[PDB]
Assembly symmetry: D2
Homo-oligomer: 116 residues x 4
Amino acid sequence: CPLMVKVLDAVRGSPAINVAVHVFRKAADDTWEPFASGKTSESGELHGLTTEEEFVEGIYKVEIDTKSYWKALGISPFHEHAEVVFTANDSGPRRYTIVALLSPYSYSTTAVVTNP
Amino acid sequence: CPLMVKVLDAVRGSPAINVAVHVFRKAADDTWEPFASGKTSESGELHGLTTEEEFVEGIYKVEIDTKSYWKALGISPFHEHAEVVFTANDSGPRRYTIVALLSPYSYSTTAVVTNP
Amino acid sequence: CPLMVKVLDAVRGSPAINVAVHVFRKAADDTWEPFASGKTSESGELHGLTTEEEFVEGIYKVEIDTKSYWKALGISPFHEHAEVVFTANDSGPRRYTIVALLSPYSYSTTAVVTNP
Amino acid sequence: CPLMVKVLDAVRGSPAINVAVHVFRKAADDTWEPFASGKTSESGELHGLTTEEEFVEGIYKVEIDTKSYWKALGISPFHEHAEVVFTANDSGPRRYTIVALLSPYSYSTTAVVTNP
């Protein structure tokens, strides 16, 4: 599982469930070509976005739809979304877990990168 | 006064100096128009990007060039950049401070929004 | 497993392995009585600190020895340790996961609290 | 100038006003001696705790009463308080800004340490 997203809710103290996540790869012309999406599970996790073979070196964008999450809880948010943009696999294939810690006016994104 | 960016280095506990920041605004056609740019000072702050009259309602994107900051310190960080995307001034003029806390594999962004 | 600690390293992008963790319960006289300790595993996790029966309502302190972790990596740290102090089980027994995101001059502690 | 505490509310994107802060210093016998105290102003800042001459080398503890802040807003938060424990001035006098970013189930603390 080369790419995993985990989302936590710092207001409720819970996994952030049903958060939509879209993944893009930067194209030759510098445009973003959306290619894996999903929604987080009851544990706040989204597994299964891509496979080893398809997840070649490149620049990737993970867009986490935080604004829809906070709207569905009735809480005003600041950001339109939380993006994470990174170059993948530059030194070989890696497994990436992106941990997003969400508050309405703040978030953090951390990568845990492990070698298979 | 209406938009200020503050960048801090969480490894050294210091302002992140000379960090490039580019601000864009979403046009009516949905493209990202360049809006303003600058670099952080010795205090890690970037003041003077815009004016109350030019900073009208809209969706703005702040991209902070965190990769070049780390690369100049010899580090190959995770994130290509830190980007903050938000609707501004939707209920009248506000002052926005965007705080970014940088680590090689993590970043934290917070908005402090005040009504002048 | 009523209490789990997960520690991440934002400088390397990895679980923080071999981090010492001590757990205390506040005594009747307001002193801290240390009672579960352990060290994080290769996944940055520490499971098995306490059991359902023993983890009664009370105020608990989790001390994470961040300073020793950063010293063992050769990196100067700011904090002596990261503490987390919380009242447990005030509305019934819960499972607590404490997520600590570590940088040398910054950290965050988040609780994910789930009902069994 | 030598110690300032800044507290921000990540739910509202605002300074956290009227937050009580107590500072202690570890004595030669290992007890925590009261050192100074104050409350955050309308800007979320607490200035004036100490002086360069009184703030000698030592281990200091800053406890921020985050629980009472949340309780006054109707919220039962996770943490009893946010406590920052650090050695100060070990290589000569420095200026310390302790930044705390608060959410009901998370807090982020960062030290910015400058040499005047």
